[PDB]
């Protein structure tokens, strides 16, 4: 029992972290097999960042200008290429600590662990969700660029995120490992609008099921609702409209607790319309949306 | 910017995790140098746990009865000894992945990362605080015993906790790595009282300083207080009485923000007496006490 915002063990990702320096800019790289992945803004100076022409900037760089350091060993760069907003530096040495891995593009509302790094060194790990508006509310400082987001299925690391920037509002934006930004964001020092965000309804319901499993039950009521009635309340409160697909993925949780998904929806409706009344659920005084139904199943059953 | 409940990168601890089986009970062991540490209840059966005589139980066990498995390799047990509530199994092989490490006994209110494991496999990592009453509010299931709590200073892992049990109230109890329980707890299947808990005042103030650093400022007021006036409010709200030692460790945060500690105390006093008024601080609707002043400095400055 007990429910925590648990991150994946970051070990397989720590062995992949390197420091990449180009000119006077230092950031984090991800060394997998004989390739190092990093944000393409490693080639820019402060003045370049206002409106960079990356193709022009990269033309003035040679293999020897990219300094890649794996803690104490220096890697030899034998090739470089830009793919979208990432640079791929071919090294002459395959990383001995390369785990089994995949590059995946995650969906909004999905969750992942972030290994925050500075100068190629791991500082900490935390679990986060990709917001419906494609931003993440992380904890990133200058030097954290190139830190990655990932998920792990047994021995396979699915890299889903690489950190690129902090928006003027303090929220974060990055790309998948092919360098495509999540969201409308561009790697330029300009004010950029992040879309209207919503709360991830399915995750809040999964989190309500986790609370029932662990003993927090005061919010359960004698009511029920329909998807259409619930979605009118979700609309008023800026919650993602609930679909049958969401109801289907909540099935294992509904089955284990014996509380039908629309009955749980009715508890969420009363919580939205009346607040928590100065009470807590799994140590929180607000409705948590950073646990997917999958995350609740995994934690509640003890999957390693 | 941004503030997250960040855990230490768990890599150096994952390389130390092993599975320990004795008879029909399986749990987690910690392999450091040529010694494996695990809870002593690995030698008990369900019937034994009601009132175990550990010395008697251990006498019927030989080196060959302790099965220690490091993933795929089997370790050869050449000695066994009980120290308080832990068993130390001497193996003939020093763990090649042993990091630089220390065994430390932490103080109540201090924080650490927990690497939850099942059958010697790491499932996830999360940050937690040792409650003033010596319990932890973790996320532990059957099989998690022997999972450890730790802190990391550059290349040194300070092991501070080993998980032993779940109290009837769903809260957790364990020992330091010398097998001494934190708190009055005993490794027996009996109902055991955990003392009255309090909120870690110094950590809540550190967390208020983190909120100021990251932009959440609405709670700052035109008031001030004294340690004596503040402690009367801390008494009414079951907060740990603030001392000059706590005021001294908040110094770096007070210095960086320019908000005197007693001025921050006055903000906390108004928050305790008036609640959050349906607002949030660093994404929380309650007063967070799981970040020490040290944790705030480290995260806010980017220490790896
Ligand atoms: C300062 C900072 C803090 N946290 N995370 C990232 C940070 N760095 C940047 O955002 C630098 C940068 C500027 C403009 C565009 C891009 Cl792609 C990158
Ligand atoms: C079931 C469980 C869940 N979470 N964490 C630990 C768990 N196991 C136990 O507490 C087993 C046990 C019983 C009595 C005394 C001791 Cl020392 C240990």
Curated annotation (Swiss-Prot), chains A, B:
Catalytic activity, as annotated: TSAVLQ-|-SGFRK-NH2 and SGVTFQ-|-GKFKK the two peptides corresponding to the two self-cleavage sites of the SARS 3C-like proteinase are the two most reactive peptide substrates. The enzyme exhibits a strong preference for substrates containing Gln at P1 position and Leu at P2 position
Q: Indicate the segments forming the Peptidase C30 domain, all copies.
A: 1-304
User: What's the effect of swapping residue 205 to V?
Assistant: In strain: Zeta/P.2
Query: What happens when you mutate residue 189 to A?
Result: Does not affect ability to cleave and inactivate human TRMT1
Superkingdom per UniProt: Viruses
The active site annotation covers: 41, 145
Task: Enter cross-link residues for Glycyl lysine isopeptide (Lys-Gly) (interchain with G-Cter in ubiquitin).
Answer: 5, 90
Q: Which residues lie on this side of the membrane: Cytoplasmic?
A: 1-304
**Listed result of changing residue 132 to H:** In strain: Omicron/BA.1, Omicron/BA.2, Omicron/BA.2.12.1, Omicron/BA.2.75, Omicron/BA.4, Omicron/BA.5, Omicron/BQ.1.1, Omicron/XBB.1.5, Omicron/EG.5.1
Q: How the protein is affected by changing residue 142 to A?
A: Does not affect ability to cleave and inactivate human TRMT1
What switches its activity on or off, per the activity regulation note? Inhibited by pyridone-containing alpha-ketoamides compounds 13a and 13b. In turn, alpha-ketoamide 13b (tert-butyl (1-((S)-1-(((S)-4-(benzylamino)-3,4-dioxo-1-((S)-2-oxopyrrolidin-3-yl)butan-2-yl)amino)-3-cyclopropyl-1-oxopropan-2-yl)-2-oxo-1,2-dihydropyridin-3-yl)carbamate) inhibits SARS-CoV-2 replication in human lung cells. Inhibited ex vivo by michael acceptor inhibitor N3. Inhibited ex vivo by compound 11a and 11b.
**What subcellular compartments does it reside in?**
Host cytoplasm; Host Golgi apparatus; Host nucleus
Residues annotated as signal peptide: none
- Please describe what this protein does: Cleaves the C-terminus of replicase polyprotein at 11 sites. Recognizes substrates containing the core sequence [ILMVF]-Q-|-[SGACN]. Cleaves and inactivates human TRMT1, preventing tRNA guanine(26)-dimethylation of tRNAs. May cleave human NLRP1 in lung epithelial cells, thereby activating the NLRP1 inflammasome pathway. May cleave human GSDMD, triggering alternative GSDME-mediated epithelial cell death upon activation of the NLRP1 inflammasome, which may enhance the release interleukins 1B, 6, 16 and 18. Also able to bind an ADP-ribose-1''-phosphate (ADRP).
Q: How does it assemble?
A: 3CL-PRO exists as monomer and homodimer. Only the homodimer shows catalytic activity. Interacts with host FBXO22; this interaction promotes the proteasomal degradation of nsp5.
Name of the molecule in the record: 3C-like proteinase nsp5
Q: Give the organism the record lists.
A: Severe acute respiratory syndrome coronavirus 2
The gene for this chain is rep
Counting on the full-length protein, the chain here runs from 3264 to 3567 of 7096
